[PDB]
Motif scaffolding. Structure first.
Motif, PDB file in Angstrom:
ATOM      1  N   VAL A  91      18.576  68.176  55.759  1.00 55.87           N
ATOM      2  CA  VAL A  91      19.936  68.704  55.841  1.00 55.87           C
ATOM      3  C   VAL A  91      20.167  69.272  57.251  1.00 55.87           C
ATOM      4  CG1 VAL A  91      21.574  70.418  54.841  1.00 55.87           C
ATOM      5  CG2 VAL A  91      19.930  69.237  53.342  1.00 55.87           C
ATOM      6  N   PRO A  92      21.315  68.949  57.886  1.00 55.10           N
ATOM      7  CA  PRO A  92      21.568  69.484  59.233  1.00 55.10           C
ATOM      8  C   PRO A  92      21.622  71.018  59.254  1.00 55.10           C
ATOM      9  CG  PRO A  92      23.105  67.712  58.695  1.00 55.10           C
ATOM     10  CD  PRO A  92      22.423  68.093  57.421  1.00 55.10           C
ATOM     11  N   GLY A  93      21.096  71.607  60.326  1.00 57.94           N
ATOM     12  CA  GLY A  93      20.928  73.049  60.427  1.00 57.94           C
ATOM     13  C   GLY A  93      19.470  73.444  60.267  1.00 57.94           C
ATOM     14  N   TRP A  94      19.198  74.750  60.292  1.00 61.59           N
ATOM     15  CA  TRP A  94      17.814  75.246  60.281  1.00 61.59           C
ATOM     16  C   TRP A  94      17.347  75.871  58.962  1.00 61.59           C
ATOM     17  CZ3 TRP A  94      14.012  73.540  63.019  1.00 61.59           C
ATOM     18  CH2 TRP A  94      14.227  73.059  64.332  1.00 61.59           C
ATOM     19  N   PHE A  95      16.112  75.536  58.591  1.00 64.20           N
ATOM     20  CA  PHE A  95      15.413  76.075  57.421  1.00 64.20           C
ATOM     21  C   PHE A  95      16.106  75.828  56.075  1.00 64.20           C
ATOM     22  CE2 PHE A  95      14.759  79.484  60.875  1.00 64.20           C
ATOM     23  CZ  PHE A  95      13.817  78.713  61.563  1.00 64.20           C
ATOM     24  N   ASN A  96      16.811  74.707  55.949  1.00 58.82           N
ATOM     25  CA  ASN A  96      17.608  74.445  54.752  1.00 58.82           C
ATOM     26  C   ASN A  96      17.379  73.092  54.036  1.00 58.82           C
ATOM     27  OD1 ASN A  96      18.717  73.002  56.829  1.00 58.82           O
ATOM     28  ND2 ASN A  96      20.851  73.578  56.406  1.00 58.82           N
TER      29      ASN A  96
HETATM   30 NA    NA Z   1      17.434  71.519  58.079  1.00 62.20          NA
END
Ligand code: NA
Ligand code: PSF
Length: 109
Positions: A91-96
């Motif tokens: 999923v785009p973005g961090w730690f998700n």
């Molecule tokens: Na991610």
């Protein structure tokens, strides 16, 4: 989730991402529980639309990747195929990233 299958027969390990987006998502299957980053012992990887990489033709996706139908099919199972598998929706973005472990148990035919 535990999936029970027969030796010498295929199995499908379920993994669905309902709101899949072709331009935003990608996924991988790996052997062993999901690590913090990526898939360990990766068996298969997709981009947004299709399988781009595969350990061998023993592993495939029967559903539509474009619609997040990313359940793994394993041909002709043997005892070494038993254990935990990692399905990882990126999923785009961090730690998700959506990480999910699936145990596969196998029985004699
Ligand atoms: Na991610
Ligand atoms: C907290 C923690 O567990 O980290 C999560 C990971 C992976 O982050 P994503 O789940 O967005 O995957 C992003 C990409 N698809 C992937 O698979 O890695 O980030 C790091 O490795 C940096 C942590 C180190 C900093 C202490």
């Amino acid at each position: 989730d535990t999936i029970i299958g027969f030796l010498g027969q295929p199995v499908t390990l379920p993994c669905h991402y309902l709101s899949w987006s072709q331009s935003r998502n990608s996924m991988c299957w790996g052997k062993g529980s999901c690590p913090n980053s990526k898939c360990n012992a990766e068996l298969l990887r997709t981009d947004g639309t299709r399988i781009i990489s595969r350990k061998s033709t023993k592993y495939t996706l029967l559903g539509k990747v474009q619609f997040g139908e990313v359940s793994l099919t394993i041909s002709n199972t043997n005892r070494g195929d038993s254990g935990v598998y990692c399905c990882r929706i990126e999923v785009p973005g961090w730690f998700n990233d959506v990480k999910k472990n699936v145990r596969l148990e196998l029985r004699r035919a």
